């Protein structure tokens, strides 16, 4: 498969990644002072990298079209430098084809209370007052 790959610090996992590899080449990443003696001095922010300049973005990625469009070579017609591929194998999917998420409860919903029942069990959940991956990470 494409080496579309994201590097994370565990201390920052799920909030802000270090580096985004697109098709095997670094496309976007944390980067500090361009004039500095190393890459880590302030201000460090997410910036596009060599994978995002000139013709590179196209060489590293896929535009997805229908098979019919590809049969006509819309990649050629449209003058695209990005690789074009067709989507497929979508008309025979069921919920059971979703990796680790194939559950199929009997669901009822009360038209007045809006209460949801799944497999006989009334679903109720508390209202969390906070979430992780937020106050520790963001300047706004």
């Amino acid at each position: 498969k494409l080496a579309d790959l994201v590097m994370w610090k565990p201390s920052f996992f799920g909030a802000k990644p270090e580096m985004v590899i697109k098709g095997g080449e670094v496309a976007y990443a944390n980067m500090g002072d361009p004039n500095a003696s190393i890459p880590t001095p302030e201000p460090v922010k997410m910036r596009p990298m060599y994978g995002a300049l000139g013709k590179a973005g196209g060489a590293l990625s896929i535009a997805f079209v229908s098979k019919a469009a590809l049969d006509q070579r819309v990649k050629v017609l449209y003058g695209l430098n990005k690789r074009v591929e067709a989507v497929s194998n979508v008309r025979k999917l069921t919920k059971l084809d979703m990796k680790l998420n194939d559950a199929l409860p009997a669901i009822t919903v009360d038209p007045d209370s809006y209460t949801v029942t799944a497999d006989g069990v009334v679903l109720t959940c508390f209202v969390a007052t906070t979430v992780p991956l937020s106050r520790n990470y963001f300047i706004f």
Binding site: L2, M7, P10, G23, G24, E25, V26, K99, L100, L133
Partner: protein, 140 residues
């Protein structure tokens, strides 16, 4: 601390309460691929010299914790032609046991240091409204 966690170790995801346990490690203790002055990935040592040039990895990501739907593991990741070429123990078959012919770090191989980091697939957002190009930068 040097090479990232190994089989049995657990890793807190960000500041959540989630722990990921290393399920499997491909490392053979003592031959980890680490790059730097005096380090392992040098000519004729960890960097192979004399294998067929066409099979050198374009890039190796070293000592990655991979979190993926298919497993949470510790592995080197080799990239070739924009694709994921292999996942396992990489390095130099002339000097190290357990290096298969699809995981050679060679002269012409770039190094992305994964030690201590998590790698996951790039995320795929399948409910996008192309309202402005800046959504895109915010996404990547």
């Amino acid at each position: 601390n040097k090479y990232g966690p190994t089989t049995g170790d657990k890793i807190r995801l960000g500041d959540t309460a989630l722990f990921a346990e290393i399920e499997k490690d491909f490392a053979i203790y003592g031959d980890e691929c680490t790059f730097g002055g005096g380090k392992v990935i040098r000519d004729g040592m960890g960097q192979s010299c004399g294998h067929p040039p066409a099979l050198s990895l374009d890039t190796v990501i070293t000592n990655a914790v991979i979190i993926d739907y298919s497993g949470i593991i510790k592995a080197d990741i080799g990239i070739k032609d924009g694709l994921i070429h292999s996942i396992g123990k990489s390095g130099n078959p002339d000097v190290m046991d357990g290096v298969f012919q699809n995981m050679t770090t060679g002269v012409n191989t770039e190094v992305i240091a994964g030690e201590g980091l998590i790698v996951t697939a790039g995320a795929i957002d399948c409910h996008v409204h192309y309202i402005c190009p800046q959504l895109v930068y915010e996404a990547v």
